[PDB]
């Protein structure tokens, strides 16, 4: 209700950039090893977005060292330091789950040039 909505508004981030499925994004996240805390960059195609307020999430898919990796980021998590859109993709679906069966040329996404 209003109580929960208030508790979530006071936590939600304010600078989340606009991105859409098919966009290529780079997400800088905080990696804590021993005592040192640094940023690791995960770059790939956004294949799913879940708009749920504080509980918003998005899935990014990349091909790292010959293996397909999908990572689901909680948008307002403090561990997600930064999100930047490196390329705008032109798709017609909200969820690009068909990309899991495609590799190389077949997985190309046309650029949204406007």
């Amino acid at each position: 209700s209003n109580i929960i909505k208030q508790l979530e508004q006071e936590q939600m981030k304010q600078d989340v950039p606009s991105f859409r499925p098919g966009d290529t994004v780079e997400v800088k996240v905080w990696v804590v090893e021993g005592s040192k805390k640094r940023l690791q960059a995960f770059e790939g195609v956004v294949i799913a977005i879940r708009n749920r307020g504080l509980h918003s999430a998005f899935t990014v898919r990349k091909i790292s060292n010959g293996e397909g990796v999908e990572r689901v980021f909680q948008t307002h998590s403090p561990v997600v330091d930064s999100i930047s859109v490196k390329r705008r993709g032109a798709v017609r679906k909200a969820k690009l789950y068909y990309l899991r069966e495609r590799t190389g040329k077949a997985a190309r996404i046309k650029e949204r040039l406007n």
């Binding site: 209700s1 804590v32 504080l54 509980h55 998590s77």
Partner: protein
């Protein structure tokens, strides 16, 4: 220590600065008014009766109205009792706020679990279903055997069978108190507590510790 009566508002998350998401239940604990104090001389045991919330004046019956009026408090939506330790002492009409849990680390939350209705043995007691194929006849989710032969020639009491599941009093123990918000009358506890959204909860300091 005594507890409080609250309402289950819902579930959320709290993001700590070190990147941890804590699942929390939000409990709206408004002021609890003491409507009666019981002692050894008159009642044989030491406890306080409290009420909370508000009720329709035309849905408060005259017996309830008189009981509230003797205490001099507004009619709440119910009455609950809390046993008193020998140190604790309250007075009729006193109001107790969520600040009582300011220094409490863990709590026990009791509520009426969500009702499932008439439930089968598979759902209610985690019985294993019989084979779905391989000739099985009409006996896919049935209990199976329910006893031995002529000895004892009966079914034992407490046999696990199908029946009403849920809609009963359930207590979850030793939940962390994530946050006590006095101004909003909020108790944020870590984890899930019994009952649906908008149900009554009884929150006590943890008895195990």
């Amino acid at each position: 220590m005594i507890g409080l009566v609250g309402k289950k508002v819902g579930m959320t998350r709290i993001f700590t600065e070190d990147g941890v998401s804590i699942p929390v239940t939000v409990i709206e604990v408004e002021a609890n008014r003491v409507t009666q104090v019981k002692d050894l001389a008159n009642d044989g045991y030491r406890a306080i009766q409290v009420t909370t919330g508000a009720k329709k004046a035309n849905r408060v019956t005259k017996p309830e109205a008189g009981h509230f009026a003797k205490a001099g408090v507004e009619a709440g939506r119910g009455l609950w009792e809390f046993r008193l330790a020998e140190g604790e002492e309250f007075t009729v009409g006193q109001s107790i706020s969520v600040e009582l849990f300011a220094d409490v680390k863990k709590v026990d939350v009791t509520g009426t679990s969500k009702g499932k209705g008439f439930a089968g043995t598979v759902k209610r007691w985690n019985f294993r279903t019989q084979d779905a194929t391989h000739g099985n006849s009409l006996s896919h989710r049935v209990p199976g055997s329910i006893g031995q032969n002529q000895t004892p020639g009966k079914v034992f009491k407490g046999k696990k069978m199908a029946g009403q599941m849920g809609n009963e009093r359930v207590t979850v123990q030793s939940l962390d108190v994530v946050r006590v918000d006095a101004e909003r009358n909020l108790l944020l506890v870590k984890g899930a507590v019994p009952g649906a959204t908008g149900s009554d909860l009884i929150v006590k300091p943890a008895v195990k510790a």
